[PDB]
Design a protein around this ligand. Structure first.
Ligand SMILES: N[C@@H](CCC(=O)O)C(=O)O
Ligand SMILES: N[C@@H](CCC(=O)O)C(=O)O
Ligand SMILES: N[C@@H](CCC(=O)O)C(=O)O
Lengths: 415, 414, 415
């Protein structure tokens, strides 16, 4: 009988996660996730029994401080503690020097995580907005003042009281009709009444003109620039602190890179204090979430798009990928598995099972994915939900007017 | 033997700034800055080891009158206490007489620093602003012309007619109602009157449609005014005092100058009290901040533009450069360093390292809103302070209407 | 006795130019310009007598093509043909290695020349512009059609002709008052007259609104972008061909430079065909001017800003300076003249005479003082020259109305 394969892996969602009944299930059954499905498929094609394990120290693998010793997941392969690795492990030159990688099974880049700056919800009565509350209150007091002054001037000695129609109720209707610019049925024929009319016409002209001009702005623009994605412009500021994972390939990439913007970013990240780095990706996400949008974490696009699709969905991804990298299955130098694993990965990609495994785990759970991306269009029509408050005011006014008419009729009959 | 060289240099930002480690570390770690980088680049081209030392008295200096003794920075070179000087130090003829300068590495002029006024609120009568004054005159004259012509055309005594109700006062009211885009109770009802009406309606159509285009942006202009710009007005007044660094090249420039405006400014500086000079630049900048805008300081554009980047950014540059001068490395007469240092300066300027260090020290470290404030998203609502001017003329008109009514009544009653 | 100094120079405006009477004057008097003044000042300080000459082959000069020989200005200094050079000779490392340069007397950078895309003058009747010629004519025919249809319907059997006031002249006034949205005496009281009225009201609502909306666009922002500065277009497209002077420091700078965009520009300029280079600056300027704005020339700011003053003032400078360089007086290695000449240049700069020379030559003869750069503030008020056409139409209409009234009165009297 052949020896069982000692597979080794790392806990990371959705690649590997705990089963609900891990307290009672068998050691293999405790694990479920994307990598467990892939491992079963590869084993079924190659034909070996296998036993799962979790890496003893939870680090993806990096090179120690010139001691030439390797951290946990690469070390477990190199020092012969494990026989194969199946995990989200990136293909890099320094790893290729010591361990043999298959062809990639997924393609990915580097991406920024940020906390979303809320969403504005206009009220029912939004049309009131382009003028402040104090303006509406002062317009009401001005209307009452003009109405009573015009009555005092008109129904006061022409000597002859008949001459002027402007009782109170008519002066109040005249000034209301004047403010709406909806035309008139009488006009004053006296010097003092004409000066009060002409001043009210000027006030109306300026107030209505400025109201309709501002409306345009409020209804022709509604967007916010947000923190710029361009990493050079991110480097140009210190209000936000950004950091990578500890012992991850992203950190080695920033260390090794000599591109001027990336060298500047590494120079900041090496010299900045306190420690911006974290031990786990979930700790990085939580530290962004708690830090009131003041801190950022650097993480790779396949994990980013998973987190973006999970509640509470308060995160945003900005900008494109900075690079392009593959994940591949790794096996220890000079080992028989390397060729059949290569043919298995090719065959699975050629049938298309790998898309089925991604769909099953990433997007099937994408609860917030309903049309959240929106559009950048600038000529959208208005929609009835924006207007309804005016319809509610109109129908309430028709109800009130009909009630007043009925009580006036009943009183006039009884009186 | 490759002995270490001694550099003499002065603390000034961002040329030479104390690093926080300096309590813990040796002097070459203690300091960082643009001059430290440049000194490293020059040493790496020339190939020698170097030690950085601070000039004892902290003065660039000039030869004292009637004693003819040079003070600190020039003295260190002339008296052989240092091998080279690398600091912001200006090329001048009096120094060229005794020490050898490389080709200049940066160019600078003399500039005025002032404490900026806060942006002013727009005026009370802002609503009239979108149209020029000549338009409002021509509008008034057109209104008078139309009103009198429309009176003259009616009431023409045909071969008795009284149907044309357009007396002068009613014609003047009809024209006013037509311009405000308000309805009126009478209309011309004769051919010539209908021509005059139609033409006034077309004129009105254009005027309004070109004043209501942008009325809210003019209510929210947000900024205006500056106290001085000419860089000459300081010569004409004594209300604001202005002062230069002590012992600096700027002071010698003003002393030597025979330009009339500069000679007048020196004569003021030679006689005004209490002393306008300061012992360091930082003392001058602080004095400008404290003096509530009553005092200005004269300093060279690299300082002005650096200080403008740095918080709190309450200080600002106005006007152009008064003259053009270069900074250059200084070396002691007949020393062998002169030619390899000079060729190193040329090579570094041709490669462009000096531009990279300029951007890195001056401009990357900016923090105030001058770095970017151009988004100008839509101004929310429209507060009462912007509109209050229209309420005052309304209530004045109501008060006048009551006064006119009361005089009319009391006259009619007796 | 003294030995006359052989000064050598190059013809280039405004540094050196031909005197009007060069056919009759002495060989020294034939020349006048900024450098002749400077040369007289330096000679008056140093005290040597001098004789002017013009460099034979007329090139500033650069290291020859692997013959290791030097061309005209540097060669005439090195090989002992001349004793001093006074010209806009740029300080550069390769020249400093063989000849000695004084401190710089003027500062310059590299700048781009482009042909200005003309200007548009608004007409007297600009307010007509937000619509098209064909729309105004069709609005006139629609007004006539509605007027006559409304008459045909109203003054046609109510059975009673008195019932309708809408004779032709009243229908024509009613429809005019309707189109201005200015209100009117009377309204039709019949079904057919009300349908024709309501359709004319709808047409008026849509047409007027559009005009006032588009007026805003045509009344708000008017500007032109021009080709992008800083060689962005020149690096990113081949549509514009850009040349530099031959045997000039600019060409050596582009050859030597290793900055990525500058290296790309040199790679284009070396490989591009036909030859973009020129022998003289005036030829480069002329080649830009004739080439309908399709060709560009690279030249340093003192020339660019001088040429902007010159007629026909159709050139524009775009972008900032690319670098920083000085001109210095040059003297041949070990020559005694270098020590006093350097102090003379310092003294002249320290008194400020060089500013006076620049002001006199560039600015005081800069009589193209139109200074069309203007201002960029968007909140600019309207000006009477924009409006006057409406005032001319108003006053002509008042004159016509008053004449028609006089002829109607005279006919009424004679009839
Ligand atoms: N896939 C990454 C995980 C760590 C990171 O995102 O930097 C790796 O192999 O190192
Ligand atoms: N660079 C100047 C500093 C003092 C000043 O700005 O006047 C000098 O050499 O003295
Ligand atoms: N000032 C330039 C002239 C030639 C050019 O503009 O390229 C030089 O000294 O070479």
């Amino acid at each position: 009988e052949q020896k069982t394969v000692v597979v080794t892996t790392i806990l990371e969602s959705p690649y590997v996660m705990m089963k609900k009944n891990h307290e009672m299930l068998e050691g293999n059954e405790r694990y479920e996730g994307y990598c467990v499905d892939l491992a079963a498929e590869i084993a079924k094609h190659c034909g070996f029994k296998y036993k799962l394990t979790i890496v003893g120290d939870g680090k993806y693998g990096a090179r120690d401080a010139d001691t030439k010793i390797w951290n946990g997941m690469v070390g477990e392969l190199v020092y012969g503690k494990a026989d194969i690795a199946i995990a989200p492990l990136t293909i890099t030159l320094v790893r290729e020097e010591v361990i043999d990688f298959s062809k990639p099974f997924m393609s990915l880049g580097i991406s920024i995580m940020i906390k979303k700056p809320q969403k504005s919800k206009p009220g029912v009565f939004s049309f009131l907005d382009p003028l402040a509350y104090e303006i509406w209150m002062c317009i009401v007091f001005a209307y009452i003042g003009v109405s009573v002054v015009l009555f005092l001037v008109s129904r006061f000695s022409p000597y002859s009281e008949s001459t002027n129609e402007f009782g109170i109720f008519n002066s109040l209707w005249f000034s209301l009709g004047a403010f709406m610019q909806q035309g008139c049925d009488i006009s004053p024929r006296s010097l003092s009444g004409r000066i009060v009319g002409g001043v009210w016409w000027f006030f109306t002209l300026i107030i209505i003109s400025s109201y309709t001009a501002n409306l345009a702005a409020f209804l022709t623009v509604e967007r916010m620039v947000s923190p710029i994605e361009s990493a050079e412009d991110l480097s140009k500021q210190t209000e936000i602190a950004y950091g990578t994972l500890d012992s991850g390939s992203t950190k080695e990439f920033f260390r090794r890179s000599k591109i001027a913007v990336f060298d500047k970013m590494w120079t900041y990240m090496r010299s900045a204090e306190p420690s911006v780095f974290v031990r786990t990706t979930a700790e990085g996400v939580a530290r962004v979430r708690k830090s009131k949008g003041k801190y950022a974490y650097l993480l790779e696009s396949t994990m980013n798009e998973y987190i973006e699709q999970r509640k509470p969905c308060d995160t945003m991804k900005v900008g494109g990928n900075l690079d392009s990298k593959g994940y591949g299955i790794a096996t220890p130098k000079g080992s028989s598995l390397g060729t059949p694993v290569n043919l298995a990965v090719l065959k699975l990609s050629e049938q298309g099972v790998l898309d089925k495994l991604k769909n099953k785990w990433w997007y099937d759970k994408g609860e917030c994915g309903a049309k959240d991306s929106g559009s950048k269009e600038k000529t959208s029509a208005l929609s009835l939900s924006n207007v309804a408050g005016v319809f509610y005011i109109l129908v309430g006014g028709l109800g009130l007017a009909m009630l007043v008419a009925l009580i006036e009729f009943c009183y006039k009959s009884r009186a």
